[PDB]
Amino acid sequence: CLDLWREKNDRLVRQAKVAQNSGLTLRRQQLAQDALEGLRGLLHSLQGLPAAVPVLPLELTVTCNFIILRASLAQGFTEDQAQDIQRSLERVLETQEEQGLRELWDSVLRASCLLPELLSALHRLVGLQAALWLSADRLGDLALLLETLNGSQSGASKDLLLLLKTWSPPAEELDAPLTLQDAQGLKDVLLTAFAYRQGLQELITGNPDKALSSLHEAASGLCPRPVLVQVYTALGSCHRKMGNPQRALLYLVAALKEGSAWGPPLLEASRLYQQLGDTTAELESLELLVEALNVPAPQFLIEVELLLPPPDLASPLHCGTQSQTKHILASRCLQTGRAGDAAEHYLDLLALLLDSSEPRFSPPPSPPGPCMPEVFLEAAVALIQAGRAQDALTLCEELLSRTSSLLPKMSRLWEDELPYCPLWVSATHLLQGQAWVQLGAQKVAISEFSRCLELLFRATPEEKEQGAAFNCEQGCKSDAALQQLRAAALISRGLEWVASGQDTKALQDFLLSVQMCPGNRDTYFHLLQTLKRLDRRDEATALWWRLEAQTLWSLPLYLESYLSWIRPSDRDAFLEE
């Protein structure tokens, strides 16, 4: 009977391995699921018995091949495999000699210390459940289990890496019922995988020196090329943090060469050149990366990728998609003052996002970045600085066309804090104004500035009373953004009274801007210039004293670039006059 079950186990293992080596995406998974149903039915058949001595190492060979091919197909460990381990463990316990896995393991390893000749399968089962606790991040009691497996007097060694190094595989795995993978293949995997995970965790928490050691350990040994790439990139990140530029670059180049997936290398490159201040090379790295990301097998076995965690945002291995990076490029291009180029990139970004019907989807920037109206606004700001104001009007008008239905009906306009309007709407009138200024139209400019000013005071944007949508969480709520934008539009207006020759009205707007943001100093330059023109002495000195009484946090980017744009270079010189 056990000959037939064992021949069946050997048949399904052979079937799973044929499927792994050969086949296409369907036929592979078809034979794999056929083998999976086979091992499930065989496990039920074997559990049909009360688990005596000769069924045990067969039941465990089946259980191992089952959790292996389960997690390789499901593409992740979970708790069903742990409960099947518990089942096999109760089968070991009730044969020879309940509460929880730790004490259960201690008692089963106590029974193995009696040495029944199935320790080759017990250590493999420990390997699989250790893999489970590792991918589930249950690191503490895993150390306890392996410390109980190895000698107990090595218990002061709390660090896991030495514990996995001391943990031997038990046997050469003699002619037992056949298995898909040996405990040595698990040993090498568990070492590199935990070393990687530990290295990255220590990296995020600001030990990019200690990380180097762990990663070299993870590099030396079983290391599949994809992770060797991610490791090298992490080494580039560690070097960039310490300071050492040239080793950093060396790691990055090596990573590019070995890699077929060289995004995160070039992102780290860019963050390096940013540290060095080689702005042109920085931009060139990102420029390259975009063309790079333009380009877009699961073996029935337990590999490292299954154990490696999905990466976070702090990681150097977080690399968004083509679109989130073309937006990084354009953001850094606008941050630098290459606005002609920045305009081209932003029109390529919006082309990606709105000419997206047919091809594979290109997503908008992630939520921690800008929402989609702030992408149109930064686009308009860029084209304004490029001297292309007649296009920044067709941009803003298209933004207010598509969201008309959202905009308020301005019947409150007659009734004149309570009603609601998000900042990006006000901001569009502000930019649509400054656009008319550059084309030289005083009247419609002061008109548009005034309309922006109205929306900022006769409505509140932070009305998160009724959660009606995917509202803008952060960019279009910040009170710092509101007060700086108020001040911005007041200034942008005041100068148009000056250009037209209505200096008293200009004075009123600059005064209000001073009342709103007294720690901006752009306000003061304009105010003191006006008072020095008309009535210099007393008020000028009175506002000097206000400044010296006074003497950026998280603004959106379209507002930062608008303020940096309008402000005059000779500010502090005049502020020292």
Partner: protein
Amino acid sequence: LDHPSPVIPVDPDACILPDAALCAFTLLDSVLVTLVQGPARWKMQLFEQPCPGEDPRPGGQIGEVELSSYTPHFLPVLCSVSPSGSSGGFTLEDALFGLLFGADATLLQSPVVLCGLPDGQLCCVILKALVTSRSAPGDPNALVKILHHLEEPVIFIGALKTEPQEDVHCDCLVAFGHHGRMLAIKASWDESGKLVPELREYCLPGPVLCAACGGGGRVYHSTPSDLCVVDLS
């Protein structure tokens, strides 16, 4: 359907994406949004589907997510809600579209996917926003959001042309409980010069068994007693 006894058994050659844990799935133009039960947390996926007449393939997965809110007989339900200007689903009108899914969805002119789950709560996910990778994993708390928490399982989601006064620019959103909480939503822009949502939790009798939508705000549903009918128009 050409497909060159009158019974014909299907060979597993016809199988495509045998994910073997997938609970529900729907289709949009060039895409095959599915929804697959993992362990406790259910996860939405999103695939290509090759536009030219080839081997009928899925393609490689564009995106996934994790419906973190759902922690488990009743299959869930999916509905596509593309807007006008951009398909088996329902096209809403722009004012409503903007009320429910916001500026992001309006501007990208992105289809939206409403999943009612057996839990009851009914979550939406924007597709254009749902592109992810092993270097870029889909963030649930950002990417999937939750209109309304019906207490009871979900049977049908639809949309209706109230005010009728194929591509009908629907105006009304309907959800339907097992135990008969109906819920309807429509756009107002009332009382303050602001767009507001119209919630109604109606309460029909019965265990509801199925639902559909007919011309002009009528909703044919079927209690255990008889095929009944409701008008919103």
